Amino acid sequence: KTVVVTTILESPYVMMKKNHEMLEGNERYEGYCVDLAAEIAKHCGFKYKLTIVGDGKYGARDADTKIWNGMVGELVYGKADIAIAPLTITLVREEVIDFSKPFMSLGISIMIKKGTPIESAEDLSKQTEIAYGTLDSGSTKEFFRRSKIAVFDKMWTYMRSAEPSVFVRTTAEGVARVRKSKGKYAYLLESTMNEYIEQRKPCDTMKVGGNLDSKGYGIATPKGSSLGNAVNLAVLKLNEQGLLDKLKNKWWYDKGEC
């Protein structure tokens, strides 16, 4: 009866509360997606258990094993009933899981340390002094891996073979690498996160250029899941009444520091 919700620790979507070690269950977490799960759960009338993805990944299909990892894997293999997280709706995932209409719109963007002489993807692609990468097992990397668009194909060719590896295991590590590389590392990630980090101390990073592509985050459920149909309508409802915009302001700007 209790719906298992898989998610991933990613600020400001899901964060441990400062005093989480004294709390149990869902109360240990806070954030935009934790607030969103709370809303969906009560408006849809069900009990749920928030569970952090074991491997801490969003989800990609291994070429060798053909196995899905991350949150996508938890849904594909029956470990979770719904994923409420900043999970990008993409063709390859849509073939194996169901997504609700987008609860948030965004795009791939470039994060640089302030002062870095880069203003766009074209600039990055036509130079080597500034290394750049993205998150492993995420949609951004798969976007670049499968892209045949000139500029993006060139960036992928560079990234897939760059040494040291330009890929990071977590967004936190990518941001930390941008902050500690003295302008020599640019990080490709979704605009929403880029925007979030831009407003967090030490305020030493910035989003440059426009978005490279346009995507959306949706709540995901196993293919042909009964719950998915209802959740999709619940998300549409929450959006129309301004709850999602309200949540965005609360977690991005009301808590900003720059």
Ligand X SMILES: CC(C)(C)c1onc([O-])c1C[C@H]([NH3+])C(=O)[O-]
Nearer of residues 117 and 210 to a second copy, judged by Cβ = 210
Q: Which of 249, 133, 116, 127 is nearest to 192 (CA)?
A: 249
CB 166 within 8 A of CB 159: yes
Among 102, 183, 209, 256, binds a second copy (CB under 8 A): 102
Q: How far is the CB of 161 from Cl ion (least distance, A)?
A: 7
Both tokens of 207, joined, read 């989003």
Among 20, 42, 49, 101, binds a second copy (CB under 8 A): 101
The answer on whether 61 is annotated among ligand-binding residues is no
Q: Does 165 bind Zn ion (CB under 5 A)?
A: yes
The answer on whether 177 is annotated among ligand-binding residues is no
Q: Does 64 bind a second copy (CB under 8 A)?
A: no
Which residues in 217-256 contact a second copy (CB under 8 A)? 218, 232-233, 236-237, 239-242, 244-245
The answer on whether 86 is annotated among ligand-binding residues is yes
The answer on whether 109 is annotated among ligand-binding residues is no
Q: Does 89 bind a second copy (CB under 8 A)?
A: yes
- Residues forming contacts to ligand X in the complex (CB under 6 A) are 10, 58, 86-88, 134-135, 138-140, 171, 189-190, 193
With both helix axes pointing from N to C terminus, report the angle between 150-161 and 139-146 in degrees, rounded to the nearest 10. Answer: 110
Residue with tokens 């990468």: 133
Q: Does 27 bind a second copy (CB under 8 A)?
A: no
Among 30-38, 96-104, 124-132, 170-178, the segment contacting a second copy (CB under 8 A): 96-104
Breaks (C-N over 2.5 A) in the chain follow: none
Nearer of residues 173 and 213 to a second copy, judged by Cβ = 213
Q: Residue 245 binds which entry of Cl ion, ligand X, a second copy, none, with Cβ cut-offs from 5 to 8 Å by kind?
A: a second copy
Among 42, 94, 117, 126, binds a second copy (CB under 8 A): 94
Among 105, 127, 157, 165, binds Cl ion (CB under 5 A): 165
Residue with tokens 């806070």: 30
Q: How far is the CB of 197 from a second copy (least distance, A)?
A: 21
Residues that bind a second copy in the complex, under the rule CB under 8 A:
89-91, 94-95, 99, 101-102, 105, 143, 146-149, 213-214, 216, 218, 232-233, 236-237, 239-242, 244-245
